[PDB]
Amino acid sequence: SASYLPSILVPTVGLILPFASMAILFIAIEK
Amino acid sequence: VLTPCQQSEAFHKREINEVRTLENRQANYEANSPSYLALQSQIDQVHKRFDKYGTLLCGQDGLPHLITDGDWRHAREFTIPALLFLYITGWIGWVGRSYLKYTKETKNPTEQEIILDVPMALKYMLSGFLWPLSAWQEYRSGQLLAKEDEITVS
């Protein structure tokens, strides 16, 4: 049981994925 | 199982509990207080209340249930005020229909509905007493109904 993987995966999907998804979708308004 | 209510235990438990509970306020007054006489009348209206529910069916709850099958032993429970009620709003409905087919053919049907013509109103109020065999005989003439009234697209 890798007890360290949510310490990486929970923030990188919880906050930084709705940064780059805001960039991909919001610039994809104009792309 | 619906026990007959005059012998059910929790029923008479509610008898002792409500006569005693309402009786607890009755010792707050003297022998000739008006409130004390009022709670005398209220205790009378509880013993009469529980004796007049004798032939009902209170189950394990101690509360008198009803039956709506038309078993003819439960006819005073449901079906006698059922036929009674249907007579009363068949009265009301036939009065209102008969008055609208009055004011439909008058001078100005708009002013007829604000100001009810209490002559012709109280004509139809009382004349609509026998609506089964008067509404039924106006149904056999093909006149209770209508045909080819308003509708939308199809």
Partner: protein, 75 residues
């Protein structure tokens, strides 16, 4: 409008007169809860007549009329 208000205050003074326990309330106000309106005895609702003291029951005032009558000096 003032006619409806004088009917209203004449109503409060009459419900204070005939129906209230204000005369008994004037004796011990901290024990007797103020009541004017004495509910007519129909099915059940006679239980709304709260035994608030004063020897006579009825539903309890919250409008505070008895305090304005003790202030105004109505005996």
């Amino acid at each position: 409008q003032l006619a409806i208000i004088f009917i209203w205050l004449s109503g409060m003074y009459f419900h204070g007169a005939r129906f209230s326990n204000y005369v008994a309330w004037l004796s011990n106000p901290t024990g007797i809860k103020p009541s004017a309106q004495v509910v007519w005895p129909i099915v059940g609702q006679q239980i709304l007549n709260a035994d608030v003291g004063g020897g006579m029951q009825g539903i309890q005032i919250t409008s505070g009329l008895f305090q304005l009558w003790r202030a105004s000096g109505i005996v």
